[PDB]
Symmetry: C5
């Protein structure tokens, strides 16, 4: 409940309870079903676009949510959420398939845990990608796709789930402007292994101002 | 007179470490942590009017209280330095940063016997902001918003310090740029999707090429 | 058992067992024989090519597998595989002998351990190499060779062998890159130095590529 | 007795028993006297456009902690110690615009009388006055260094040479003079001062006269 | 018996029980003798204006700690050991102008007779004499390597080839000769000397066009 959110001892006790119960290295599968992970990229900036190399340098807020109901507690007289270092938590092992630089995390590495077991982790990331930059100087713009999913968990273990112009988020001072952002679910079988991986394809349709 | 009593200092640090919860916000009573922050600009290193990006160095003055850390300093040190890893510090971020904050200074805070904490890292960082007009007489106005990344307004308030007349007092005379005005104001951020508001300080840096 | 994959307590128990048994700093030699490590590079991108200095910056999936039967478990009624942080496991001490930067790991540092004891570690790596870049802007392209093997274990301790599947070597290469891969070979190779009797078994990867024409 | 290995291990143990790495080693209720001397080795880059220099210096840093002393009548006079086992002064350069990059093993020497010597080779960029670098009298780039969080009552930081024994002969530049002077700074708001050292690096480009 | 896994695990346990990673392994109150041999792999960038070079080399580093030795009559002769479990010499290059970037797994070999071999591949930049690089006789770039904090009484650092087994075919440069000569450095202010190896890299631009 709101009134108790700022009760420090309660917050300390919740963090203790979460660290007691959390298994940071085991997927939080419940009821023999895959962990349902939702990913939403809020684009903040498009910093460099190279039409010769088909590369983009971007900043996005990666809103990542899933549940671990073993973390839940009765918050009828305690805080409903706390901030938790992600090192204390399991986090989905997401990777961007067409990323060509390491992800630069620009923000404090803390997640929110809600008393119903919901977890929210939303880092600001700067990262470079190989994608189709063709058309960026035209009115219809370019469409750059970013493909994200679990790097080591197949669809039986983790599933990823997905039409905005990101007006609340995207920098008005970018040389570029966003026309549309859409996400589509993807299921892929790769050469290495017989089971499929789920991914989200995020399509960033943008153009130079 | 007691500042240099080493055993006293050791005991204060012991006490602080016994009491400190580095991962828990220090909400006293049932009120949000009152965090004060002010950027004292030290340098403007690179500016790009085409890309609207700036590279700057600033003192990030950060202060708050945790009364549980207070001690009787009648016959002991009034202040000690403490590694920030031993303390809770606010999870501040700049919303329009496009690089990680590069901390240039030792990551030590000062804890005062009344429980006041002062952390002031010197930081180099790059931002996306309005660089238009930087070569004109009236200059460009680049705004930086700084707030708690994961704590909403009910948990942490991030407000300007009481002093902002000194925001460019420590600015390098050897910069290619000169600062015309700095304001630092309360600002609240909300998103249509969700109930949380985030309290930040909006810093408006008005500057121009010399 | 694939039906038991989402049994969380089972996964946690398997992880516990692996960590009790694993010796992260000791080679998993079985039967006084060398550890057979398989390595195959699947190329994803070529980021920079410097004709002046003969250097290339590349992104590749480093497919790495080996066995440690001591990690094996009965999976008749439990998960067939789990993900494990590589810090809990022995991993081969591989290095590229002509690399001129650190390998930059772009993906989560987790391996897969299979119930028969096989381990699969496949990081995406961005790394720079010194190699032959002449010909890149011609029809027949440039050929850059990368040699990968154990840095400290000679052939008596570790054998580093290629896989025989190469059809996917450029299958995940970016369609948007300025470059295109013409051919890839991955072959067994052995290096010895005149000073000493040790041989080092490695995989030699030959990457034939060119700049796409207008 | 220097190479008596067991003696060295015992000294390291004794130091780690008594060392308080996060507490200033104030003795007899006086400030810690910290000596600093920058021995410049290389001037890597000078940007006349931006007033920036990129340099390498050896940061000779000394102070005492008598609690670390031992009787060395029949034991080693000195050992090397990882600085993570020691208190070290929280020095910062006020006009640094990059992180200090330490190029050398992060070990200090501890002497049996309790003297500590820490001398990293540091590469770091500074904002300073580079005008005149192409003239006969050269540029003078001043670097201000002191304790970032300790006032003069807690730490005092204290310091003429042309650095000929240290500066690279192969540098593009040559050093005319390096001066290092005591500097006390009090901020208007508050009563307590910081003790700093002002290092003045007077240098110039070799072969200033060119054919254009 | 090399591949007996339990044997290797027991050897690593024994090494970790006896190893003092922070204490120099002096035997018989004599200095630790460290051998260093740089195998040059590549010369990546050279600048004759600033006298800087960017190179890659394998740093073959060897020394003994007999306390680590074991009877290998019926056990492995050698094992790989993370260097964090071992004392390693605190070597530094005096004229380095960037930090040593270690490109390889940080593992050493320990031999059952107590011999230790650590050989990182290192990329690093140096200030040295690059003059003559575009001539037949070439430039000679000297790199001075020694213990950073141990003087000659504590550590001794001791060492002709063209490195044709190691040097990259694809360098824009070629090696004429690499020599390594024992050297010793002393400074006027202080008594002790530092032993170092002086590595003389004689090299030149490959396949250069000449005026004849
Ligand atoms: C989250 C925001 C917006 C303000 C910045 N921090 C956060 C945040 C909140 C919680 C955890 N991590 C970061 C948002 C979520 C949806 C729209 S915005
Ligand atoms: C590996 C893939 C493809 C799908 C993404 N994850 C994996 C994976 C599987 C196991 C461990 N680490 C990553 C491949 C490697 C080579 C061709 S496919
Ligand atoms: C060592 C080599 C050559 C193969 C690469 N690794 C090693 C190695 C071997 C052991 C430890 N660290 C690296 C050599 C030594 C002399 C000539 S070669
Ligand atoms: C603080 C200064 C000025 C001198 C440098 N360090 C500090 C400092 C002090 C405390 C903690 N962290 C850094 C100032 C505050 C107001 C005017 S100046
Ligand atoms: C110290 C030197 C010379 C260069 C080698 N190492 C050291 C060193 C010695 C001890 C600790 N840290 C570094 C000097 C001091 C004064 C003139 S020279």
């Amino acid at each position: 409940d709101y009134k108790d959110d700022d009760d420090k001892l309660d917050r300390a006790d919740i963090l203790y309870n979460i660290r007691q119960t959390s298994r940071p290295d085991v997927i939080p599968t419940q009821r023999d079903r895959p962990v349902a992970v939702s990913v939403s990229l809020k684009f903040i900036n498009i910093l460099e676009v190279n039409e010769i190399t088909n590369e983009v340098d971007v900043v996005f807020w990666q809103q990542t949510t899933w549940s671990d109901r073993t973390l839940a507690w009765n918050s009828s007289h305690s805080p409903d959420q706390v901030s938790v270092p992600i090192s204390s938590l399991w986090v989905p092992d997401l990777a961007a398939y067409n990323a060509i630089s390491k992800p630069e995390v620009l923000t404090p590495q803390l997640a929110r845990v809600v008393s119903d077991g919901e977890v929210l982790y939303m880092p600001s990331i700067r990262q470079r990608f190989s994608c189709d930059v063709s058309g960026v100087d035209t009115e219809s713009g370019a469409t750059c796709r970013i493909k994200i999913g679990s790097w080591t968990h197949h669809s039986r273990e983790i599933s990823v789930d997905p039409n905005s112009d990101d007006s609340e988020y995207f920098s008005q001072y970018s040389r570029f402007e966003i026309l549309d952002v859409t996400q589509k679910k993807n299921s892929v079988t790769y050469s290495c292994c017989p089971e499929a991986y789920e991914d989200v394809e995020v399509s960033l349709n943008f153009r130079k101002k």
